[PDB]
Subunit: 388 residues, 4 copies
Amino acid sequence: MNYQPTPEDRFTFGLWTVGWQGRDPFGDATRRALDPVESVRRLAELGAHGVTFHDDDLIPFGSSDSEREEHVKRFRQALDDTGMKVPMATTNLFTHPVFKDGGFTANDRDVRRYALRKTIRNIDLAVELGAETYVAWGGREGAESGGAKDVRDALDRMKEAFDLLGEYVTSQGYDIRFAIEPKPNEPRGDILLPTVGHALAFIERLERPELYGVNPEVGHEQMAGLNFPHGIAQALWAGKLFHIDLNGQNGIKYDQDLRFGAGDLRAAFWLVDLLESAGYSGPRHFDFKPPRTEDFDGVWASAAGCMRNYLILKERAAAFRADPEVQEALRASRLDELARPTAADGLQALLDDRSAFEEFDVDAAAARGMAFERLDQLAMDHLLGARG
Amino acid sequence: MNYQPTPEDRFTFGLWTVGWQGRDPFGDATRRALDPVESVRRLAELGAHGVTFHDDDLIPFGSSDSEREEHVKRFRQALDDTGMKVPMATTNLFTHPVFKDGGFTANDRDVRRYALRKTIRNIDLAVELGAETYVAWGGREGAESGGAKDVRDALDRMKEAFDLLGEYVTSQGYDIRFAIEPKPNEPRGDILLPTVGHALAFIERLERPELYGVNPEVGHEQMAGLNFPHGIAQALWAGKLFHIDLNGQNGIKYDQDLRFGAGDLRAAFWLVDLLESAGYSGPRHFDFKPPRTEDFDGVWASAAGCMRNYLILKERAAAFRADPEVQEALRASRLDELARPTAADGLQALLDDRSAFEEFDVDAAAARGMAFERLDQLAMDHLLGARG
Amino acid sequence: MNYQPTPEDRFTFGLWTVGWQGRDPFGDATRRALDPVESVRRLAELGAHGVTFHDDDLIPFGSSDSEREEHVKRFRQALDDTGMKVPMATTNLFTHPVFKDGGFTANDRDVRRYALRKTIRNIDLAVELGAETYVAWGGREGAESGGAKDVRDALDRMKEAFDLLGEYVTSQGYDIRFAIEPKPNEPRGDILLPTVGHALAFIERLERPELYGVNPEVGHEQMAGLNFPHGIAQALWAGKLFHIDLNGQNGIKYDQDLRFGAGDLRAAFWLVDLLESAGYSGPRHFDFKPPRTEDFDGVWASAAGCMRNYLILKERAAAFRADPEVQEALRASRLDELARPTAADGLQALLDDRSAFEEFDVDAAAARGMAFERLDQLAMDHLLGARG
Amino acid sequence: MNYQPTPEDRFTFGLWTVGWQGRDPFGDATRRALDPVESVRRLAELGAHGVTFHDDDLIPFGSSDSEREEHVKRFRQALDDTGMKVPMATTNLFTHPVFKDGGFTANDRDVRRYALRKTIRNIDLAVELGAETYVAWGGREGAESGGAKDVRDALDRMKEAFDLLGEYVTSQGYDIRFAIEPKPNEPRGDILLPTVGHALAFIERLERPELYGVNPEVGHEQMAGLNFPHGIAQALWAGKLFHIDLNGQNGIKYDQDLRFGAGDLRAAFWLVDLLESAGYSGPRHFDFKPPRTEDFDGVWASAAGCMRNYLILKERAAAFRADPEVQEALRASRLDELARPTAADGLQALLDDRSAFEEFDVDAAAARGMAFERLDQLAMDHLLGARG
Ligand SMILES: [Mg+2]
Ligand SMILES: [Mg+2]
Ligand SMILES: [Mg+2]
Ligand SMILES: [Mg+2]
Ligand code: NI
Ligand code: NI
Ligand code: NI
Ligand code: NI
């Protein structure tokens, strides 16, 4: 069994992932900076499909227009030399001290206008480079204390910001959609739109909701103790899974951003099963941090492992679903019945149906086991490659 | 300072709260059952406005129609004798073994039809007793294992169920709205619609969304580590806060349902500040469990304390907002600016505005402190009644 | 590959595990009670080595001495007929309402004396049946509120209780040791001795510490977000791992008690690696609850799966440690150096050693990568049976 | 009511607390560096008793001996000019990249010897400045992955390190004790000795345990969902509370280090009640980070608020314990009985005592309520200054 990725697998990486220098709240960098060109080349050699960037990863904050142009031209040449694509881009509205109280929801109105202008400039660049999705991660939108932020006013400001961005895109005629990335906390004590559900709900209040989806990250929903495959199912059900960030997280703690497959391994299996069976066709993007224990050899080993673990889990999920004994077990657990309408006959027929209440044998129904444990042990056996 | 509740304060209690006998996963009941009539009388004497019920709290599961009628007539007489109201009602779709895999999203189709019929019968009763809101808590909708539940199919079934309920209500001409109560886990390993955000998002996919809101519970959002006042702000912003359940919870663990004011006390303060400043006009309902250490005297002491703590926090939040030094601090932290539009001048003017980018002094902006710590210490001083 | 357990594998089960009827805080039993004799027989057929019990699982609370004698005689015959052993026993000091504020640390002194007497009576029975370890799980020792329990007084009472139990055992000449089982919460809001560390620390203050060890449970340390293999390593390091309870838990929430291998699968792998490489020789006991969705067929499927998952992980951990490439990777990550003394040369030599400070090249040291990511991907490959 | 601290209150602050520049994992510094001399002066003016330091906060990493001497002389003059004391000091073994895999438990043996030498040099300085307690926080001792660290070997290395430090102190004749500071995670995925219990247990295996205690931090135990006052009670019970770090934390997430009184306010009340009623006489040290939203005015406001909130809670805990109605409630809840021995009469008398088992009326005992809810509402009323 080997598991070599190819660009057709649509694996992508942010520049800031393999380029993370290892600075954490308690320690200095353990690695030197990587030139974006070198990252593109190394990732292409590993079998990646593409890369993504924040404005500030590519063009140093404060660069002159002429320095701007040269950074972009070198990057473009790297993409041309390797066949790598740029499917997604985003804005850094969190590192510079001016964003210490947020970008779109900063209390200072002048900061909010600046955040919008910085964003628009990068949307134009994203379109130029061929990106299809523009992510917004409002990492500084939130508060450490209750009186610092009136959340209804802040949501008004957030809606206003996204509405203006949609006006811009439509007026310019750009073929790009937005994806909001939720996170419950860190670096703010609580972040606005903390989960996939809150982001989905917010989108429905925007002026042009069809332009907006979610970019969920495995570790972020897990920082709220939530079931990531369930949240992705809800996003797929809503037609809003525009992009996805893959990584690993061990429970409720700081955002670890481990390589994909690390952290909750069974959740990774059910996630891949869901993405492949739903036919999600977008990038498989890894937003991860090689641990700061590693040198550059360990950075590339960690990046390769992201892709490797996806392909192993893809093979095991596929074998699970194709196994005749598993298909029989799904029927024994009535997954087929779950998929049938409860009352296609309609309300009136349901009300008139004595077998649904008056004559329903609740005791006999209650006695039926669901057979879920046998089903779940077949899933475990498939995951571990122990089928017998 | 005294803090006596009156029915005008709109405090309400479920029958199942003061009536909880103390059975937990590891122990037998520590208290005898309470007759609903006796509960109505005792709560009226404490100053409560009303009570709520599950079908099965009022009418024993399996009761004959004639026994049904007598249970209702005695209850009605109790309400008549005391002036107590019944603003909300709900269905028990979780205790009986037939619901072990859910009600609306059970894999067995016959169980799903039964759950709908049991619900409709209680909606009619709720209307008869004057309830304005019908809550749905899908405590068994979910799974312990990944293959047991296809969540997209389950959401189809959940939508189907709520759509049929809305058809029923509209066809009957009833003046009642629905409120979905989220919970992330317990008793299932993961519960569908685990947070206020996921429930809000789901509602937007229903056929008649205006009939549906949320019933958030303080402890449930806290079981996901979320900021409850922030989630309530989002529900208010959306126009969907139809009902609310007040209690206390100490962190991420099993659902404690402590009396209101216990658990996260500062969160209770910011919640009351928000409810009163938004002019929420619905019931202040307590869904709590007197600890099983208590006898009946401690049950009524715990219930009284729920109301007492609300009224103390209401007085402290009001004093905070009325304090001229606090109003000056809110301006120093630019809460006034948060409430002003970022760009009422419009996209084009924003793009043409050199002071928003080209000439914006990012360094000067970054240097401005937000003054949030002084604001939060004034809030602490007000909460503790230590103002100087 | 097959994975059939035999009694030499020392797998054991509590009567209360497969016998759990499915009652949870929100629902009635979904299964009928099992006779202990039938459980012994079914578990023997599955390949179990032995069973464990609480006093009240075997002898109904309040039984007459003569009824007591018959329950024991039937049970003994079942053990004789099957070859099953009883390596551990414990006391129920949590179900009866008299224990609502604890057993050994109840505020009421008469309850504390009763708890000791109930315990001693079962120790005699445990010895008669051949148990080597007596577990104490103080599930009701704790509090929901801060003033209810003075924890220093409560620890005095807890020490007093365990000291008296050790006096009893030594005076009777019994060959039995005690194992304290920690749990952070549930059913009390906070439980005393909440983690393996707190229990280890407490033991050192007892009069005869050598008689006491810990019985850690996978899910309990995980309810505090802790690393279970790390806590077991500390218990092994201390010489105090007398018994262990195996199950699965998905994160910080209510105590799920899933079958072993469910929940955090990578943690299960590192745990088995540690137990087998340390040569832990005690029982592999499963304290788990077959989900209440299951009928009796699913109960036995869940029990079998506990044993199956242990044996698969045992095979994968063994292959990992035996793999020459893994041994080379451990050396590349300097695990060999971790095992060598830092300063066997002694304090004075260390102080005189200029290469340890004055002449140490901190920059060169800092540049060395730890190679942990490659090591961890070899572990992942072994776990998934994907080695190439 | 006013609440002005004086040096007799023994409030202390680390240099790194008010001096935190605001750099977090996602953002640059928002404040300029503070000179230690200026911090000493400002804190003295606020009423602080003293300051603490890491070696590297006072003497820049890599400083020449002569630069070392000047940094110390200026600092000493500041202490002399203000009357401020230095009760505790510690070592930075976490910021420099050489410590990326730990200090005392780094896999590289040469790094471990360096960490010891760096520590010893600062112990000498601590003694010179008058410190009584030397803290060790092993923030890098731990792992992100299971094979990276053999925890039994790592504990051997940790014991070896602390044993050598105790040899040094005793051989030099220094009057200083060590205090180990636990933390469950961050910056490592899991940190060794993650809680107060694990640190207490470890100490008992050291060669000279009387030289070692714990330095618990409010937020750290709360990052594991634990009850901080309960853990402090266990440390007091053991005679090992040598120092304490006060701050605030909102639940299980990244280490917030908010000002004391923020986060879990009721836990802060029960902590102060316990410290004052046990007569803890050590420093009240604040290890906190003024949020990076603040300018220097907000830094000093946050520091003042730490002290203010301690003094308010001290007044409320004292009023609670002195209230005759509270003393009557404590007796109603049998706290007096908790403090009496269970069996001072001895094992034999207990075994012979028919009223402890044979004739004990379990039903009557079970019926007695504990009256904890009334007690806890009196505590709430006292905390909020609402007594009536
Ligand atoms: Mg991301
Ligand atoms: Mg509720
Ligand atoms: Mg157990
Ligand atoms: Mg600290
Ligand atoms: Ni992340
Ligand atoms: Ni609840
Ligand atoms: Ni458990
Ligand atoms: Ni901290």
